[PDB]
Structure 1
Amino acid sequence: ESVKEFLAKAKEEFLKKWESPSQNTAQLDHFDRIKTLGTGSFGRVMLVKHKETGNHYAMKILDKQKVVKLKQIEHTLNEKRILQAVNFPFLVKLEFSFKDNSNLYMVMEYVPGGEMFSHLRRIGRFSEPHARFYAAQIVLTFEYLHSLDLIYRDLKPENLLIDQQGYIQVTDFGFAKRVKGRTWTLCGTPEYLAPEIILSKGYNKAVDWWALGVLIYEMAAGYPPFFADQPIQIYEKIVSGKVRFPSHFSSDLKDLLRNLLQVDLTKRFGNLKNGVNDIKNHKWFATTDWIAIYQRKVEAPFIPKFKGPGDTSNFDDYEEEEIRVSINEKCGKEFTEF
């Protein structure tokens, strides 16, 4: 009953914000630009500092014209409407949002510990306890999101930031969607795609549970289970029903992974009648105190090294490009709701 009442309150609070989204809660000239933290085909993430409070934030800047060209309009509207409505310990918090003639802006809490991607590659692989600590946080986060009829659709190490306490905060909701029944978009990252995405089916939250299997494998092995030079070669491996495990994996880990990396979505853990509890009650999670993880009372395996809330050392160096704002409004109609 404890979990039922928690999730009922979570949905109440989400729906109130979902139905009346915040808009236009800051503007660009309230911030100083510090450094580029990441960059992609239609946006970037910047470290900024608020000029009055001195607080640091990670500002995601999306170019409206490039969003349109790359068919991401609805996805960007999803990202912001979802982020302004959710509230969970392992999700990066959206602090402000606004738009201008050229760009969309989402101003997020700044997490100086960096992406799990870097730490995983630097350390090689995580021990099973270390992987399990992160996996438990993802299990709880997906339980939360799925209860709101959301699908995340971009689980991978680059999207998991490590905070000052060593806990995960999930970033980048660019593919997240509130799904009415099932959905169809081909999106995600190739190595993490579930078979039903590759096969152009209408799919559901089971794709997130598949991706969790990929993530756990990658954390514990150091490399993902399905990889190749060309996407079609990755996709052939994904749909095949075959996966090889390192001999250092425990039997319990292999068993869990066979049930998450189940090609038949109707048999996949997380998508059965017992839902998330098939995962939470699996032997691989026997040592996990789910409440203590939620309450952030477990000592983390690893605390990132950083010098203070403005340190960028855990992020890498990118060419520093202009943040230009056109004198004319672009794509106003498309982004009305943002």
Structure 2
Amino acid sequence: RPTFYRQELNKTIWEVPERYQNLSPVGSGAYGSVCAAFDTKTGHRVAVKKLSRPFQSIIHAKRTYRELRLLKHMKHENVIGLLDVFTPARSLEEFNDVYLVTHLMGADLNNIVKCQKLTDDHVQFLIYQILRGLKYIHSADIIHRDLKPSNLAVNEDCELKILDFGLAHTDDEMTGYVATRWYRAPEIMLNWMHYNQTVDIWSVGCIMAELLTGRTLFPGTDHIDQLKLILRLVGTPGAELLKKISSESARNYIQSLAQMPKMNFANVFIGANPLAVDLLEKMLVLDSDKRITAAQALAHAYFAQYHDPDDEPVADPYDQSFESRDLLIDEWKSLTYDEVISFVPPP
């Protein structure tokens, strides 16, 4: 066990191993607080996150376990990984606090999109890396659920990592003119379907469109306005898809709208590479069964310059049976403690 030292930063106590030096606050959320630091063992600049109230309820304890399980599994060049996890506690009986350590990320794709002039080669490389990471995530039967520009880190060499997996966002967070909803698939925006991995491909289509034009694709002022923007571009549901729609709330509202045809994407995305237009038409489909998958998209001709089927790896299997398990707070807490003490750092 390393030696730990204590300090108070912005009214919070931080108790961390001596290896982490020069802690400086960089933000707070509802799930924790974050400090930048220098890691003397590896030489990296790191982000250290102290979870807030990790075991305050059954829901919160299960969420803490879920986050740690996910971060310990993800080992891929285009996905955020876990550098370290620690607790100052010396036993399960005194265990209360959890700290997570990752590489410190600078710019996100929002910063790139609003300030930089992107060539077609830039869009190719950025979307290629998203899809490479998504092939890996989906091969473990994980759904990201929250892909958007602020959850994609990008460095000076245009290299990209996927961040901030959806841990299961409030109704207030998705209300009104908010980027938190602009990238969500139409079948989940009003919970007309259960989540599945095809929702992430819709999000990729929205992101790629925004890199090509510099503008949000579906900036709705509320859920209904956003659905209308979507249906104007892709058309109202055809007979084949309506037959598959199980939700009675969806059918009733959908049938109240005048029918509209799918628009011509070459007249929407003026000047874009025709191969980019073709890929967008394969992502932005209402029938989620018919959307292109991440593995299929990597082989599309738009990525010919970067695609290498011997360098697009899949994940080890990921056991999610805990998600259907009913446990007490202290049982989730003990499971989390086991995962903290068994962590082995990357080479």
Can you give the 5+ residue segments of structure 2 that lack an aligned partner in the other structure?
Answer: 5-14, 89-94, 236-262, 314-328, 337-347
Distance 2:209 2:311 in 1: 21
Residue 219 (structure 1) aligns with: 211
Tell me: CA distance 1:139–1:102, structure 2 relative to 1, closer, same or farther (3 Å).
Answer: same
SS of aligned partner of 1:150? coil
Task: Find the partner of 1:48 among 30, 37, 51.
Answer: 37
Shift of 1:149: 1.0
The corresponding residue for 2:343 is: none
**Paired letter, 2:269:** P
Aligned partner of 1:29 in structure 2 is: 16
Instruction: State the partner residue of 1:276.
Output: 295
What CA distance in whole angstroms lies between the structure 2 residues aligned with 1:25 and 1:264? 54
1:23-172 to 2 correspondence within 5 Å? 28-30=15-17, 31-32=20-21, 34-50=23-39, 55-64=44-53, 73-99=61-87, 103-111=97-105, 113-123=106-116, 126-163=118-155, 165-172=157-164
What secondary structure does 1:151 align onto? coil
Q: What letter corresponds to residue 80 of structure 1 in structure 2?
A: L
Question: 1:233–1:51: structure 2 CA closer, same or farther, 3 Å change rule?
Answer: same
* Identity fraction in percent: 25
Question: Displacement, 1:47?
Answer: 0.8
Give the equivalent residue in structure 2 for 1:312: none
Runs (5+) with no aligned partner, structure 1: 1-23, 177-185, 296-330
* Deviates further, 113-122 or 253-262: 113-122
Tell me how large the CA RMSD over aligned residues is.
Answer: 3.5
Pair 252,147 (structure 1): closer, same or farther in 2 beyond 3 Å: same
d(CA) in 2 for partners of 1:335, 1:264 = 41
Preserved CA contact (<8 Å) 2:54 2:61 = no
Q: CA deviation at 1:60?
A: 2.5
Q: Which has the higher contact order (CA 8 A, sep 6+)?
A: 1
User: Amino acid of the residue matched to residue 115 of structure 1?
Assistant: D
What does residue 265 of structure 1 align with? 288
Q: Is the 8 A contact 1:26 1:98 kept in 2?
A: no
Instruction: Count how many residue pairs are aligned between Structure 1 and Structure 2.
Output: 263
* Residue 303 (structure 2) pairs with residue 285 (structure 1): yes
Q: Report the CA distance shift for 1:333/1:239 in structure 2 as closer, same or farther (over 3 A).
A: farther
Q: Distance in 2 between matches of 1:286 and 1:52?
A: 40
Residues 202-260 of structure 1: CA deviation (Å, up to 9, x unaligned): 13110111111111112222222110333442244346635763313232222211210
Question: Is 2:183 aligned against 1:196?
Answer: no
The one-letter code matched in structure 1 to 2:25 is T
Output the TM-score relative to the length of structure 2. 0.64
CA change 1:229–1:147 in 2 (3 A) is same
1:7 — aligned with what?
none
What displacement does 1:38 show? 4.0
Q: Deviations over 1:166-212 (max 9, x none)?
A: 31122212438xxxxxxxxx989311111221241113110111111
Q: Which amino acid in 1 is paired with 2:48?
A: M
What is the TM-score when the length of structure 1 is the normalising length? 0.66
Q: Which amino acid aligns with 2:36?
A: L
**SS at 1:259 equivalent:** helix
CA contact (8 A) 1:137 1:294 kept: no
| Matched residue SS, 1:152 | coil
With over 3 angstroms needed to count, the CA separation of the structure-2 counterparts of 1:54 and 1:146, relative to structure 1, is closer
1:249 maps to which of 263, 272, 275: 272
Q: Per-residue deviation at 1:74?
A: 3.9
Give the secondary-structure state (helix, strand or coil) at the position aligned to 2:335.
coil
